[PDB]
């Protein structure tokens, strides 16, 4: 009746278990699921367009600082004082400025010059760098269209066009200026469904719009998100008003904590970034470069004063971060820090890392400062901080930092294991994990740091190259083409696989109107034809149709080359053989390659009407209806 | 030896029954959640404090 | 995870024998004890046999609707399970599952069509 | 002396409604335990049959968490806070206490509401 009650009970309760364990880890993952980058673009002064550009420029120990621009209409003339009390009046002129600013591309979108020189600078900037990194990931940006991405950014607004303006550029000021167009505009153009929002938390509102992402991503509100930071200035008065405060260094150069720190530098830049969930990178095969594992955000609250910091708030969100990650302040080994230059904030910081970090360190852990090199870029400062340490990961290597002759003495430097990066290290693999800490504090007190590690080993595999490749190109205007062909040429002038290059550019992009296609089968002969290229055809197609001719078509050897290029082709012409079998006297494989009189009509005839299906199934094979 | 399992067996899988369905219930909970109102303020024109 | 392979059905006259083969995967197959069921087309489940594990001796236990004519044998080393159809009848002719566990038939394979005619 | 469960026919459903199936027995399925012997399997057309409920409460993995299932003694019942169209198929409610189970009998045949 109820005897064998074991068994059952056991298999019962056994299925029990597992289940049920299954879902407490579905549980931790949830609430705790580490977040991948598949893609980053950046724009900095100093000819920074790449990430490439920016590690070879922090590994050749090179600053970007330069003297104030012109084209903004700027009346420096007023401004620059050796007198520092001078209303009006600025003691510095030097500064890291991204001189190319005003340029842009409205024709890729369609927009009319009105609205170009109406929109503020950073919209453009965004959607630009936005592009770029999309392309980056490997992503068809049209095949987004529909899909549910959701996009998150930073930015203060800098009062762009604020004087009286003509009558014909009525109907786009206010969008034109509109934060929240921003953001929602980038949508617009490559119609997206996920949320968007933009965040002011002065310098630290990259990295909080950043978080901010991450909780959406692991609330299954979206499958993957962009996130990042702009800052351009539209007028100097900034700087004018901080020459009031006195904390601007006369140089224009942050010395973050050396002993000759006397003030800041402000800089611009644009920075964005992609993120997606670890599970469904690997799920979809998208290459990773870096490992997101915690964020921790909080605010200063009460203080000395309404700007002054406190190192216990930043104590407690290290903490908070650390936590969130799980993981123990031995693990970690670098840190970029915030590196303001400024007398007083540094070594309130210096104390709070040694309080937190500089205890029971195995090895001295390290600490960097981007700003030495650019100063503070503000908005997208704390982003731009990210790359520069993903790239640092990526090279193996740990790159120094500038303007270093003393360590400051308000620090007790044998406090804990704490050094310095005044040359590049040779940071290896060596199987276990490495991580890294990045951290913001902005004026208002709110104050945000991430944790980062590496990404998984990955297995490579060789594949074989083939005899000849074809390389397509693509472009939305002709001059676009040409430089997209003479970028493509320079990249190949290196040492690359000729069969990656085709798979990636035959997966890895879109297709346009101006087109290009040139074949080859050796790297000179890629160049050769990429510096011989002369036209484009933007012809709006018609319909198709497959002529049919009579006779006069053959020659000797007619299928002998193709047979052993094409399989699908070798099996179509072997199937007709075998079809027209029951009444042939001879091989036809051999008469097609050149091994029968061809003069003959029952023979000739046969074999074009032969070719003429096979090369008709191999049309068909590349997707072409008439 | 081994005819001291049944009842264990059974207890053991009672205690687990309920405790990992009290952590699906947690989950689900931390999952959706209600929120209280609890403090409210406004200014809107027409006299309205 | 667990996957189950189900192999050898077709067509066969009446009164002749076939094996039918299921493979398991992605578990421990030695401590299970596995089961067998047929559906006839446009009908209901009916239960056809089960077969315990070595833990409890691995006995194993028919329906008298086929007794004596299939036989159910499991091998742990290649973790496959193997029933054996003898004396076939038209009517047998049915879609067939194997499950893991005796009692509960919590995983279901992909099934397999065996008709009977001549 | 073999037990025996009975449940509704057929019952035409709505997509995004509640729905509830009852299963009453011929006897107790409780035990000493403290454990009613039940289970509910559910069939799609035309696909292997699929586990949803054991031991009348506690649910399965995998299975929607909109499905649950009460009862005790001789009475059962299964409840779906939402119906949606792909849940159409055929339901059994089945014993386990008595064996050796031998069919799964008539079982309910669920369909859309017209």
């Known amino acids: 009746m109820a005897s064998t009650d074991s068994e059952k009970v056991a298999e019962y309760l056994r299925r029990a278990t597992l289940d049920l364990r299954a879902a407490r880890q579905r549980i931790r993952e949830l609430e705790g699921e580490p977040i991948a980058i598949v893609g980053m673009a950046c724009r900095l002064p100093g000819g920074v367009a790449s990430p490439e550009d920016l590690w070879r420029l922090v590994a050749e120990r090179v600053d970007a600082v330069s003297e104030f621009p012109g084209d903004r209409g700027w009346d420096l003339d007023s401004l620059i004082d050796p007198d520092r009390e001078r209303a009006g009046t600025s003691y510095v002129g030097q500064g890291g400025f991204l001189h190319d600013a005003g340029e842009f591309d409205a024709g890729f979108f369609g927009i009319s010059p009105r609205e170009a020189v109406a929109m503020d600078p950073q919209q453009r900037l965004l959607l630009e760098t936005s592009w770029e990194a999309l392309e980056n990931a490997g992503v068809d940006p049209i095949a987004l269209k529909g899909t549910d991405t959701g996009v998150f950014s930073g930015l203060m607004g800098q009062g762009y066009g604020s004087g009286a303006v003509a009558p014909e550029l009525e109907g786009f000021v206010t969008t034109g200026v509109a934060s929240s167009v921003a953001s929602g505009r980038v949508s617009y153009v490559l119609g997206l469904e996920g949320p968007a929002v933009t965040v002011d938390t002065a310098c630290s509102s990259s990295l909080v719009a950043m978080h901010l992402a991450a909780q959406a991503l692991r609330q299954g509100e979206c499958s993957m998100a962009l996130a990042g930071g702009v800052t351009v200035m539209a007028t100097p008065g900034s700087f004018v008003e901080f020459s009031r405060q006195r904390a601007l260094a006369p140089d224009g150069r942050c010395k973050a904590f050396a002993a000759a720190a006397d003030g800041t530098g402000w800089s611009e830049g644009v920075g964005v970034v992609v993120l997606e969930r670890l599970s469904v990178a690997r799920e979809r095969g998208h290459r990773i470069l870096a490992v997101l594992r915690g964020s921790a955000v909080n605010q200063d609250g009460a203080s000395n004063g309404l700007t002054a910091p406190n190192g216990l708030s930043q104590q407690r969100v290290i903490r908070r971060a650390l936590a969130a990650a799980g993981l123990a302040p031995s693990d970690v080994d670098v840190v970029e820090a915030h590196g303001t230059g400024t007398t007083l904030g540094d070594p309130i910081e210096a104390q709070a890392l040694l309080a937190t970090y500089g205890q029971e360190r195995k090895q001295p852990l390290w600490l960097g400062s981007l700003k030495s090199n650019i100063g503070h870029a503000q908005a997208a400062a704390g982003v731009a901080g990210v790359i520069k340490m993903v790239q640092a990961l990526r090279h193996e290597t740990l790159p120094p930092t500038l303007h270093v002759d003393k360590p400051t003495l308000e620090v007790d430097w044998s406090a804990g294991a704490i050094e310095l990066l005044t040359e590049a290290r040779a940071w290896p693999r060596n199987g276990r994990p490495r991580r890294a800490g990045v951290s913001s504090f902005g004026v208002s007190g709110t104050n945000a740091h991430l944790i980062l590690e590496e990404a998984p080993a990955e297995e490579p595999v060789a594949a074989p190259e083939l005899p000849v490749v074809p390389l397509v190109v693509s472009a939305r205007s002709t001059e676009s083409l040409s430089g997209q062909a003479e970028r493509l040429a320079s990249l190949l002038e290196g040492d690359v696989s000729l069969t990656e290059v085709a798979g990636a550019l035959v997966s890895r992009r879109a297709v346009l109107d101006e087109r290009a296609v040139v074949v080859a089968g050796s790297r000179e002969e890629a160049v050769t034809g990429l510096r011989a290229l002369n036209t484009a055809g933007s012809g709006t197609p018609g319909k198709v149709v497959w002529v049919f001719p009579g006779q006069g078509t053959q020659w000797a050897g007619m299928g002998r080359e193709l047979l052993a290029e094409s399989p699908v082709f070798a099996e179509r012409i072997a199937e007709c053989a075998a079809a027209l079998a029951p009444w042939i006297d001879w091989s036809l494989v051999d008469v097609l390659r050149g091994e029968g009189d061809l003069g003959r009509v029952d023979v000739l005839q046969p074999a074009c009407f032969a070719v003429m299906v096979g090369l008709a199934a191999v049309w068909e094979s590349v997707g072409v209806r008439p | 030896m081994a005819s001291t399992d049944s009842e264990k067996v059974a207890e053991y899988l009672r205690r687990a029954t309920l405790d990992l369905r009290a952590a699906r219930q947690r989950i689900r909970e931390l999952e959706g959640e209600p929120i209280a109102i609890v403090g409210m303020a406004c200014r809107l024109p027409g006299g309205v404090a | 995870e667990v996957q189950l392979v189900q192999s050898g059905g077709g067509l066969v006259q009446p009164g002749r024998s076939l094996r039918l083969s299921c493979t398991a995967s992605?578990?421990?197959?030695?401590?299970?004890?596995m089961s067998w069921v047929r559906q006839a087309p446009g009908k209901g489940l009916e239960w056809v046999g089960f077969?315990?594990?070595?833990?409890?001796?691995?006995?194993?236990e028919y329906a008298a609707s086929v007794k004596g004519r299939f036989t159910i044998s499991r091998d742990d080393s290649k973790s496959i399970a193997y029933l054996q159809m003898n004396s076939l009848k038209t009517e047998d002719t049915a879609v067939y599952y194997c499950?893991?566990?005796?009692?509960?038939?919590?995983?279901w394979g992909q099934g397999t069509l065996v008709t009977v005619s001549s | 002396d073999v037990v025996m469960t009975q449940s509704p026919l057929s019952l035409p459903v709505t997509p995004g409604e509640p729905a509830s199936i009852s299963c009453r027995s011929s006897?107790?399925?409780?035990?000493?335990?403290?454990?009613?012997?039940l289970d509910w399997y559910l069939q799609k057309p035309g696909q292997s049959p699929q586990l949803l409920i054991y031991?009348?409460?506690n649910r399965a993995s995998g299975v929607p968490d909109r499905f649950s299932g009460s009862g005790s003694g001789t009475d059962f019942t299964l409840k779906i806070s939402r119906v949606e169209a792909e849940d159409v198929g055929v339901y059994y409610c089945?014993?386990?206490?008595?064996?050796?189970?031998?069919?799964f009998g008539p079982g309910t045949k669920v369909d859309i509401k017209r």
């Open positions: 499950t893991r566990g005796g009692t509960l038939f919590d995983y």
């Open positions: 992605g578990f421990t197959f030695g401590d299970y004890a």
């Open positions: 077969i315990r594990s070595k833990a409890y001796g691995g006995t194993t």
């Open positions: 006897q107790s399925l409780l035990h000493s335990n403290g454990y009613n012997y």
């Open positions: 031991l009348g409460s």
């Open positions: 089945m014993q386990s206490l008595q064996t050796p189970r031998l069919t």
